[PDB]
Subunit: 104 residues, 2 copies
């Protein structure tokens, strides 16, 4: 979990979306229980889907990036496909998350 | 300050009792580490004022994980709505507009 890229500003954010055909952003907060539960799931998905770029973003540290993706709950996983925000998985939901990523 | 006076659900009995003893209810599922949850407080305060026929309570998911589990609370905040002895749906996230709409419809 500690090895994926953390988005910290809008420039990095916009760069990431334009440089990657398939992208997952994990929007979390420090000390968030459901967020932490999802870490080992994300690790496995990273390995299972090497053509998808997984990154993370701390909603308290980066409230502007959160607003830009309309993130209002934690954890939320935002799915990007070819520059578009194509889907959102709200909450610690491994099954919906895998399906969403599978379809990217 | 008004948020501090709100009844906390702390066990499953209180939870089932809440559901059996109130015609209309809202449970604010929050955590102490949750920023957007804190942002919702003034909105919850107002809703409590504005909806006297609806019973409002809160539940700290870390202090009452069994209740949070029963309501499949997987994202913070979550607001669970109840009516006439059953839970009817959830508003998920810091969204006071959607929350008020769900409450208005109770």
């Amino acid at each position: 979990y500690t090895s994926i890229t953390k988005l910290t500003n809008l420039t990095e954010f916009r760069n990431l979306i334009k440089q990657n055909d398939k992208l997952v952003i994990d929007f979390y907060a420090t000390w968030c229980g459901p967020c932490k539960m999802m870490q080992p799931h994300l690790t496995k998905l990273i390995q299972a889907y090497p053509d998808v770029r997984f990154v993370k973003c701390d909603v308290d540290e980066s409230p502007d990036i959160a607003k830009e993706c309309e993130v209002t709950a934690m954890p939320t996983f935002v799915l990007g496909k070819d520059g578009q925000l194509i889907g959102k998985i709200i909450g610690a939901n491994p099954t919906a998350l895998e399906k969403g990523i599978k379809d990217l």
